[PDB]
Every structure is written in C-alpha cells, then in structure tokens.
C-alpha cells in the first residue's frame, strides 16, 4: 500500500453511472472534458474514501450511503471506475454518484495469476475500511457536499 501523504489533495465528485469471462464490474461515472482535466493528478492510482447512490431509475425518491469505496481512475480517455464495499443487489445505471475521494491504495498495476488479482482486492477492500475507521476520516461520511444540491453533473471540487 502507498504512504498516506499529504501530496494527496482530496476532492468531491458527482457524476451519473454509465457503461475476459469472469465478468468484471464495467460500471463508471461519467464526466466530460473539464472534469477529466481535474482527475490528471490522479490517473493510474485505485483510491478510497466514501460515496452515495441516489435518483435510482424506479428508485429515484431514496437515497442510498454514505458507504466505504475504492475506485480505479485511468485511460480506456480518462475513466472512473468505483466500487462500492456495499451490496445493492442490483445495478444502478442511470443513478447519481456522488464520492469524497480521501487517499490513494496503489497504483492499478498488473497481475499475473487470478489468485494474485483476488488478494490484492481483498487486501484493498480491507484498507479501504482499516482507513475509514480512522477518527479524522470517518468524519466524512457526514460531509455537506452529499446534501448539497446542484443541476450541475458532472461537478468537481477540492477539499481543504
């Protein structure tokens, strides 16, 4: 795992969910020119922090989180690609995403054998929590850019 720096500047980020045999997650958020332009110091790294789902399609009244996530942000044209540590049951394409990235896991990297791509997610997932459970960034769960409303998507802001 990366040293938890401060050469970390964490941000917001609010976006809708868009689109090998395993069937990997292929789910994104996404964003447009200006925002993909934000994200540059964070391209080849999988980050963590904390997230909501909302305006589900069927679902749209509700509200879902905040919960822990780790994501990978890359080139495929810059991408972000969450992973909730959350069991919805179902997808939510077409839902607003709303996430607080607090700090970095690794960068994305590669992988030889299954087994090795298994433990290194597992070892992710459970730093993700290991790090959230900490006082200082477990306080931004509760954090006001979640309840801020805006027509604006997608949207990036820095966190001081």
Same mark, same amino acid.
């Given at each position: 795992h990366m040293r938890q720096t401060g050469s970390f500047q964490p941000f917001f980020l609010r976006g809708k969910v868009v689109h090998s045999q395993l069937?990997? !997650?292929?789910? &994104?958020?996404?964003?447009? #020119? +200006?925002? /993909? *332009?934000?994200?540059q @110091?964070?391209? &080849?790294l999988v980050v963590y922090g904390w997230g909501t789902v909302s305006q589900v !399609?069927?679902?749209?009244? *509700?509200?879902?989180? !905040?919960? @822990?996530f780790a994501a990978s942000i890359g080139? &495929?044209?810059?991408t972000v690609e969450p992973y909730f540590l959350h069991e919805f049951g179902w997808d939510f394409y077409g839902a607003?995403? #709303?996430?607080?990235?607090l700090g970095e896991i690794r960068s994305m990297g590669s992988f030889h054998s299954l087994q090795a791509l298994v433990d290194t997610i597992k070892s992710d997932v459970q730093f993700? %929590?290991? /790090?959230? =459970? #900490? @006082? =200082?960034? =477990?306080?931004?769960? %509760?954090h006001s850019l979640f309840e801020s409303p805006s027509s604006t998507i @997608?949207?990036?802001? +820095?966190l001081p």
């Open positions: 069937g990997f !997650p292929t789910a &994104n958020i996404g964003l447009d #020119k +200006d925002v /993909m *332009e934000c994200l @110091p964070y391209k &080849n !399609p069927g679902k749209e009244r *509700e509200s879902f989180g !905040p919960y @822990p080139f &495929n044209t810059l607003v995403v #709303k996430i607080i990235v993700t %929590r290991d /790090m959230l =459970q #900490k @006082p =200082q960034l =477990q306080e931004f769960s %509760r @997608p949207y990036f802001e +820095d």
